[PDB]
Amino acid sequence: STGSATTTPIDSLDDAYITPVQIGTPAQTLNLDFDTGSSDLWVFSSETTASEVDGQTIYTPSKSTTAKLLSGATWSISYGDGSSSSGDVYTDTVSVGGLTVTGQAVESAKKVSSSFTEDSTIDGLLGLAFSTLNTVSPTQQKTFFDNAKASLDSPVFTADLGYHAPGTYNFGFIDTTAYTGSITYTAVSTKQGFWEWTSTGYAVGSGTFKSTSIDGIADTGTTLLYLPATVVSAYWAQVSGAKSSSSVGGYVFPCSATLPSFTFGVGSARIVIPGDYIDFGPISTGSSSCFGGIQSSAGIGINIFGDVALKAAFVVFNGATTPTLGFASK
């Protein structure tokens, strides 16, 4: 089997991407944030504290003839940005882009943090990291991908995120029309439960490529590109007036700037992030200070190849017995 679903930026900055997901019988379609950096499929629901729902589409398990309470199971998750959610668990039929998984754990939110409430466009998350990170207790649950894997034509999914435009998540096949040149594959460590790999280095604009190992994770659920402070300083040093602001929470730059590109290495291959991709707009409405799309990972504890990097590539998440990642230009 295969599945293919369009993923759409939630706003004009590509702050996140939502992908329609069918849950239950008859189908309830929710727009979920596909997140290769976490491993819980959770949704706003009929159980979510009413004051914490503001415009989201909710899953109502009582209206699904295939919903079953997973007795005793609870979940609770905190994300890298400080947000969190928690609740109980159903199993139900879940379909993504024509690919159907029966008995998928659908984690129903009883509580969500303010940032989730305030984002009316995201109805929940669909985790695509390794199931070892799944937070369901006392019985850990599998991701949608892990459940689907054995049925897929090939044990892979691909992320093809658009810049200010829709893109695609495919499951079970590699669309050879969706990228240019060849796909370069690189080793993955699953030891922290992430799609963790090692970039071979970077270049800033038309500068010389610096060969250096940068361990980080391919994370569709993170908006920006977070890299070591040395790397990020070298990038922003090429932008007149750019500076790190403790009050704003990272590098800012004059909105009048033309940003240089940023290249990262994947083995001997190179993925080029156009400068425009690195512009996240005024720090506040009407401001002439703009927020940078490349930020320091110092303090996070891990480097993160988030949407800013991933949207510049066609990315293969290969979930074979020995997982690997693939990157192609597009």
Ligand X SMILES: O=C(O)[C@H](O)c1cccc(Cl)c1
Catalytic positions = 35, 199
Residue 245 Cβ vs ligand X, minimum distance, rounded to whole Å? 7
221 or 292: whose CB is closer to ligand X?
292
Residues 206-245 contacting ligand X, CB under 6 A: 241, 243
- Nearer to ligand X by Cβ, of 27 and 248: the residue is 248
Of residues 240 through 259, those in contact with ligand X by CB under 6 A are 241, 243, 252-256
Q: How far is the CB of 224 from ligand X (least distance, A)?
A: 17
Is it true that the peptide bond before 138 is cis, omega within 30 degrees of 0? Answer: yes
Q: Please tell me the total number of residues recorded for the chain in this structure.
A: 330
Q: If binding means CB under 6 A, how many residues of this protein chain bind ligand X?
A: 9
Q: Considering Cα of 225, then 227, then 232, then 235, what sign does the dihedral take?
A: negative
- Which amino acid is residue 232, in one-letter code? V
Q: State the Cα–Cα distance between residues 235 and 294, nearest whole angstrom.
A: 8
Which parts of 272-301 interact with ligand X (CB under 6 A)?
A: 288-289
Report, in Å, the least distance between residue 207 CB and ligand X.
22
Q: Which of residues 268 and 284 has its CB atom nearest to ligand X in the complex?
A: 284
Shortest gap between Cβ of 204 and ligand X (angstroms)? Answer: 18
Query: With respect to ligand X, which residue has the nearer C-beta, 268 or 288?
Result: 288
Q: Among residues 175, 172, 116, which one has the least CA distance to residue 145?
A: 172
SS3 at position 278 = helix
Q: With CA atoms as reference, report the closest residue to 293 among 315, 240, 306, 38.
A: 306
Q: By C-beta, is 213 or 246 nearer to ligand X?
A: 246
Please write down the long-range contacts of 113-116, taking CB distance under 8 Å and 24 or more positions apart.
113/82, 113/83, 113/84, 113/85, 115/81, 115/82, 115/83, 116/44, 116/52, 116/83, 116/85
**Which sign, positive or negative, has the C-alpha torsion 254, 255, 257, 262?**
positive
Report the nearest approach of ligand X to the CB of residue 294 (Å): 14
Query: Which parts of this chain interact with ligand X (CB under 6 A)?
Result: 241, 243, 252-256, 288-289
